[PDB]
Design a protein around this nucleic acid. Sequence first.
RNA 1: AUACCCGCUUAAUUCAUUCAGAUCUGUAAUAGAACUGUCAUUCAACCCCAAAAAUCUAGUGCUGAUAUAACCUUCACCAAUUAGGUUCAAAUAAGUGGUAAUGCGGGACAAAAGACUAUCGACAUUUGAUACACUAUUUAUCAAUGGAUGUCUUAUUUU
DNA 2: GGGTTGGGGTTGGGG
Lengths: 113, 149, 187, 980, 108
Amino acid sequence: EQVMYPRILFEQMAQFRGKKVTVVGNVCNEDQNDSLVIEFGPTGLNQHVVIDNYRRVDLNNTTKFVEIRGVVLNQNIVSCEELTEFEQKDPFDFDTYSKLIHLSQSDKLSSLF
Amino acid sequence: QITVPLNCFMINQIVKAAKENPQAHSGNHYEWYGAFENAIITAKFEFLQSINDSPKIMGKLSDSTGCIEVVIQKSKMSDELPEFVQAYEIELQNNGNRHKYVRAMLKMRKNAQIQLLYFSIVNDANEISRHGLDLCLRYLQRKHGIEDF
Amino acid sequence: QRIYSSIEEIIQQAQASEIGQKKEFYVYGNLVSIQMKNKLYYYRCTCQGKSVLKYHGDSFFCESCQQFINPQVHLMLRAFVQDSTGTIPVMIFDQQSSQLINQIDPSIHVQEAGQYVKNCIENGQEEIIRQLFSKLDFARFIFEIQFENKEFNNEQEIAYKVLKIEKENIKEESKYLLKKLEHLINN
Amino acid sequence: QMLTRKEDLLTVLKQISALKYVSNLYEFLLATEKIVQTSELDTQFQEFLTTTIIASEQNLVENYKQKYNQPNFSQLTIKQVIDDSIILLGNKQNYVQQIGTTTIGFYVEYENINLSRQTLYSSNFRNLLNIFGEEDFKYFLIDFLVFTKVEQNGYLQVAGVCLNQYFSVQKQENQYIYPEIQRSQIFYCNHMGREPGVFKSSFFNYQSKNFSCQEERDLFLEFTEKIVQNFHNINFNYLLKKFCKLPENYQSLKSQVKQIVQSENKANQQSCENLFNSLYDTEISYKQITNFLRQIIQNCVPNQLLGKKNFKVFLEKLYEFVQMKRFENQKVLDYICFMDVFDVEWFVDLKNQKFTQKRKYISDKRKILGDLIVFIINKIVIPVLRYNFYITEKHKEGSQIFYYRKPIWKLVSKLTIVKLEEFQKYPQGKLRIIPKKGSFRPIMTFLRKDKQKNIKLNLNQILMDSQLVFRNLKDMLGQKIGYSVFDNKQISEKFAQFIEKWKNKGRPQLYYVTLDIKKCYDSIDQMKLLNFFNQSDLIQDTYFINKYLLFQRNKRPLLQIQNFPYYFNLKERQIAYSLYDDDDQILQKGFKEIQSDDRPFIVINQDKPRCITKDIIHNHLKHISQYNVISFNKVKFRQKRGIPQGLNISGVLCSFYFGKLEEEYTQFLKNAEQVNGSINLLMRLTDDYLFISDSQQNALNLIVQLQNCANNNGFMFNDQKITTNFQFPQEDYNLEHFKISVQNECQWIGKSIDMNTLEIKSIQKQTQQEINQTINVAISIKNLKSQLKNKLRSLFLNQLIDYFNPNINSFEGLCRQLYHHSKATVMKFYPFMTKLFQIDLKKSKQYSVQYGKENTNENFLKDILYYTVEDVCKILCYLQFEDEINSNIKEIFKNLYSWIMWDIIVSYLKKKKQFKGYLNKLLQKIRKSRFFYLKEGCKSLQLILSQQKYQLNKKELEAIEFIDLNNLIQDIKTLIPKIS
Amino acid sequence: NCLIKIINIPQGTLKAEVVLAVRHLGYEFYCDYIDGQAMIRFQNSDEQRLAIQKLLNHNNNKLQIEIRGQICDVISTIPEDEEKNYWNYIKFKKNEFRKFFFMKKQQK
RNA sequence: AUACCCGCUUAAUUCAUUCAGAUCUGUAAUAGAACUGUCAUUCAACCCCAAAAAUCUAGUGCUGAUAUAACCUUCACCAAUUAGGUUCAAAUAAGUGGUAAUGCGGGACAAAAGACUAUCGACAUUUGAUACACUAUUUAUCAAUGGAUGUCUUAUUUU
DNA sequence: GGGTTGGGGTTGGGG
Ligand SMILES: [Zn+2]
C-alpha cells in the first residue's frame, strides 16, 4: 500500500515512464485553463515541463510555485495526482534543490533507499 | 539523547527491525546509527480519519518515500481544545482540501502506535529541502561520529 | 559576513573553556519551555540604578541618580534554546525578550512589555501570560550567543547569554549546512 | 462542639468547603467500577488503597467511570507515563510532582532530591497504573489531591496542586501606606562631630510626587530654606545646658577615668563599679527630652507651615513619640486624624475638589500633610536625636528606652575597652555594649555582608543538626549531666512526672539544691572542645527542605452548623533535617518524630544542601575560635578563652562542652545515687542548675564533690545557695568562691516550686512594673478584630503550657496557676485596651457599622473577652486528664474555669473603674455566667447520681473533690481561700 | 440683580445635580426647580456678576452650564413680572414658615 | 457650669566639644587655637530556643435570676489604702503615693421660662434614600423637623 | 544588562 515518489528532472528522461515521482516547479506559462500549464522545475529557465494540472487550479489564491506527483508523459507532460501549491515569499534556490536531489539520490539516498 | 529528523522510509525500516529483532538486554527504544526516541518530520498531512471512542483523531502523514499514520487522544476535555490548537492551521484555510506540507513532532516508543506531539504547516519548500538535507547530514555525522568517538 | 556553529560544538568549547572566556556564535535553532516559577522582572532606574534603595509600597528611589524617578522594570526570562544537535538553558535580556513579545503581540509596546507583565501578574492575569508563553515554542530563529565559565560564590559553573535574536533564513542556512555536508563528505 | 480529639482525617477534610469530593482511594475505585468487592489483591496494597486519601473540587467520578474497556494497557513505563502527565501541565505551576523538573519541550530530566519520588514508583503505584490505565492515571494525577499514608500520623501529598499556594495568599489602598517612621534608626549611634550641628552629611550641608501641582512644592522649598537658615543660625550647646545638662562632676569624672585608664591595675573593680552606676544615673527625663525637642521644633518650622492648631497637636504628639517603647511606632494617621487640613491657609484648592467632594479633597490634603510630616520627622527629629543622644535600654530590665549623652557613652566605651583584658573571606563581626546592671555584659553581631549572613545561617543549620543529635543522645542516655537541655518544658515535664511518682511511692519530703555558673560562654577550652569533637558521633549527613502543615490549636464545627472555610487551619511551620545510613523512616519522611494528637501530615520539597563531614565544622571552628576581628570601632583584640557571645551557636556549643564535663562528673554522682537508692534528679541549663534529693547528707556530699571537680579547671561563679547547712568542707569552698544562703521554696530563672507539694509557680509582680520594659501594642488599622483575638490569645506565653499538664496535680494547684496567670494576663493586657479604647470610634465606617451601633466599646469588647474565655474553656485538650469521657464534667470544668476568668475580670474592671457605664454591662454578663454555672454545679450532682460510669481513679476522684469543696455556696467560699 | 434662570434642563432632573453644578462655580446660592426651569438667587449683585462672568463662554458669548452632560443656557436678565412672581413666592415661603412656627406655638 | 475652663504672654547664653593626624605655635612638655571627616551605607533587627495564628473571619452562649454580700461617693488629675453609708440601687468622706509650668483678663450667677413665629417654607434637628465618598469626614434634595435658633432677667433680699 | 531574598514582630528563658 506504499507508493514511492522520487524526484527527477529532464536529465533523467529514463525515469519518466511508469515511475510515479514527485514534480515541483514554478508555473512559467501561467495558462488560464486551470487544467494544463507550462512550468519550470528547479533551474533558472528552459525547464519547460508540461503540467497537465488538476482540472481546478487556484491560479490566484497562492504564488507561482506548484508541486504535484505522478507519471511523466514523454513530452514532459505530468499526470495530475495531488496539488500542493504554495504561498511563497522567498523563491527557490534551484541550485540548492538540484544539489540536494542529484547528490542525495546519487549516493546517500541511494545508500538509503 | 536529542530529537532526530526522520522520514517514512527510515521509520518503516526501524519498525520492521523492531518487529524482527527482539534486541535482548534492550527495548523500549529504537536504535539507528546510534539510538533515539523522538523525531521531527516534514511531510504532507494526509486524510483525517475520524476515530473517537477511546482514542481521537487518526492523523495520517506521508512523504515522498512512504505513508504512515499517527494518533491523538483525549478522554473528555484533555485534548479537544489543544487538538484545535494543533488543527486550526488546517481547518481555517477552508480551501486547501485536507493535504498540506507540514512539519510535526512524534514520540517513538516500543509499542505499535505513534503519538502526535505538535504540528505546523510548511509554506515554502525551501524548508522541506532544508529538513531533508539536515536529516541527511545528521545521520552522516551521527554514524561517523559515534563510530569515530 | 559572519559564521555559524553547532550546539554540540559550543557546549564542547564551553566545557573545554576557562574563566573569563566569552565567545560569540550564531545558530539556527528555536526557543521553547520558558521557566516562570521564578520572578519575571527586576527594577532599575532610568539612569541605570545600580542599587536603587528599596522602599515598600512600590516606592522608587535610585542611588545612581538620587532623585524621585519613574520606575524602569526590565523583564528577565529564562528558557531553553535547542537545535537538531543540542539544547542549552539560556537567559534572555529584556530588550530581545520584549521584541519577541512584540512579535507575538504588537498590542504591547517594546518598553511597555515589562510594565504590562507586572500589571498582569499583580492583577491576576496569569493564564493569558501562560498561554502567550506557550505560543513562543519552536520559534525558528537566528541566535547570537556568548558564554562565560565564571564562578558563582566559590562554585565554578558555566553560564550563557543570548545577545542578538534574528529571524531564520532558509536560503542561506541551507547553504551553510549543505557546504558543511560537502566538507564532511570530502573528509 | 465538645472538644478536639485524636483525629478523623477523612471527616476533617470533607468537613471543609472548597473541595466538594472527598474519599479514600479504595471506595473511589469501587465506585468508579475499576475494582469490585471480589478484588482480593495483595493485602498490603489493600491497606495502601484504604489509607490513601483523595479529594477534588468536583465529583468527577463520572469523568473517571469505565465507559469502555479497550484492554491494551500493554507496557508503558511508569516513568514515561508520569513524564507525559507532567507535559500535560505545560505552563501550570506549583503542583507536587512538578517539583524537581526540567520541562524541556517534550522531554524531562530529574534534578535535586525528592523522597516523595521514592514514595512514588512503588509496586502500589504499579498496581494502580494497571487499574487506572493511561488516561485515567494521568488525569487522576493532574486533578485529584492524592494523599497516602507512610506513618501512624504521617500522610503524604505526593500529587495534586501543592497545598502551599492553596494556603499562602494570606483601585485599592483606600488610605495609602503613609511610609513608616524608622524609630529603630534611633538606636546605637557612636558618632561625634566636635560640636552640635547634628549632621553635616545630611541635607543640611528631595523631589515630590503628588503636591498641589508644584507651587506648593516651591513654597515647601522656600520653607526648607527658612529652616536651613534657622538650623545654621541656632546654637544647641546652651539649649543642651538648659534641658539635658551634663553632671556637674563632669571634669572629675574625666580625670578619674583617665587615671583609671593609665594605672587602674588591681585597685579598680569597686571604684569602676561605682563609676559605672553613677554614669548610668546620668539619664535624662522624657519630659525634659520632650521640651528640648519642642523648643527645637519651634525655633525652625513655621506654625503657619504646619497650621497653628495642627502645630500644637504635633507638639503634643512629640511626647507620645518619645514615651512609647521599643519595637513600636506611631503611624502617620495617628497624628493625621488629629490634624486639620484647614488650619493652613496657603493650601492650594486646585480644581476645587472641595466643591467636587470635600471628603476626597481632605483625604488628598491629609496625604500631602502626612508626607510632609514624615519628611520633617525622619530628616530632622531622628537625625537630631541620633547625633545628640545614645538611645538604649537595660538588658535585665527590658524595653524601657533610656537616653544618654554621647561623651558619657564614649567614656563608658573606653572603660569597656580597658576591660578587654580578658584563610577565607572573613565573616567579620561588630560589638554592641549591653547594659545589664550597674555593670555591663555586651554582645556580638555579624553584619554588612550577604555572604557573611549566609554562612552564619549555614552554621545555624549545621549546629541545629548537631543539637538534634545531642538531644537524641541525651534523651536515650544523657551525654550531658542528663536532663539538661529541656528546651521549653520537655524534660521539665518528665522531671516533674517522675518526682511525682516517687512522692506517691517514695518520699515527697525532699531537699532542693540551687547552683549557678558564671560566664559559661567564656569557660570554653578550644583544644579540648576540638578533642571531644574528634569523638565524631555523626558523619555522612545531608539535608531536605520541609513543607509541613498540621494541626493548629482550634476546634472545627461539626456537620450541624445550624459560611465558607478553606482547607487550612493546620498552620504551616518550617524545619531542617539530617540523614545518614540509618533507619529508613528518616529516609522516607525526612522528619524524626514530634508528639501531637493523632492527625497526620507530611510534605517535602527538593534541595541539595551538602554537609557530610565534621571536617567542615572543624574549618568553621578554625574560623571562629582562633581568628576574630570583631570591631567596636577599630578594635581587633578578643578574649580567647571561650566561644564569643552573639554567636548563633554558642548555646549549643556550651551545652556540648558542659556535656563533656558532666559526662565524667555526673557519671560518678548519678551512679553513686543509683547504688544509694536513686531518690535524686537533676537539671542544668547553660549556666544554671537545680538538684533534688531527700537524703540531704548524701546529696550535700554530692554537691561538695561536684563543685570540687567542676572548679578544678578554673570555672567560677557567685550567687545565692541552698538550704543545706554546713558540711564544713562546703564552707571552705564557700570561703573560696561564693557566699551561701538558705531559703525554702526553691525559686528559679522565672519559675519557683513549693517543693513540699511540688507546686510549681512562675512569677508574680506589680502592675506598673509589668507595664514597664515589656509591653508593645499593635494598632487598629482594619486589623482590630484579628489583632485583639490573637493578642488576647497572648496567653501564648506560658499559661497555655507547662502547668496544665501535670497529669496528677489537684484542681487547687491547677486553678491557682490559672488565676495567677490570669492576674498577670490582665496586668500586661490593660495597656492594649487602655490605648486602643481612646480611639474607640463610633464613626468607624466599617467596624462600627458592622457593629450596628454607636456604643462600639460595650458590645465589641464584650465579644472579644467572651470569645477569649470561650477559647480558653475549649483549650482544655490538656484536660483529658479528668474530662475526656465523662461527657458532662467537661462542660462543668470549662464553665468553672470561665468563672475564674470572669472573677479576675471583675476584680480588674473594678480596677478599670473609669469605664463604669459599660463595666456594669460586662459585670452583668459575668454574673450571668457565674450564676448559670452555679446552677450547672447543682445540676452536675444530679447528673452524677443519674449516671452509672464510675472511673474511680480520675472521674470519681475529681467528683469527690468538687463535691466536698464546691457545693453551691462552698465553691466560692473554698476557692477564695484557694485564691488566697 | 441677584437672580438667574436655568432653562431647557433635561426632563426628570433632580435638584442635587443642578446645585452641585452651580457649586462648581463655588458661590453660595439658593435654587428652586419648577416644571424644566431652575431659578437661582444669590446673596448680592457683586457675586451675581462674578457668576455671570464665570458662566459665560466667549466661543458663543453666552451663559452656559453642563447639566447631565448636556449644554444648558441660562438667563440673567429676569423679566420684571417673573421676578415679582418669584419674590411673592419667596415671601410666601417666609410667611408660611413664620405662620407655621406661630401656630406651633399656638397649640400649647 | 464650682477651683476649674477659655481668650490673651513667656524665660536666661560658651553644660560639652571624642578620635584620625594636620598647621604643629607650646614645646620643659602640653596645653592649646584650630581646620576637615563622619556614620561615612545610613547597617538592621543580638541571636538561640520555645510556645498561635479567625485567614478574605465575623464562631454566637449560660433564657437574668440573685451579692446579702454586693453596691455607693469625696478631695486640681491618676493609683493604692482606709473607713462611712445603702442594701437597692444611690447620697459618704478621709489618708497615702504618683501626676499636673508661668503673668493678665472672659466663661460669672449660681437657671429656666416669659414674650417676640423675633431670624427663618432661606432656619438648622436628626432618621432613611441617591450621588458621592470612603480605614479618623461631609455633601444637595426627599420627606419629617417645627419653634432649628437668639433677644431681657433671675433674691427693691435675706426670694 | 542582572542574578536566593530581606527584612516583619518583638512574648518567657539563656547569653
Ligand atoms: Zn537613578
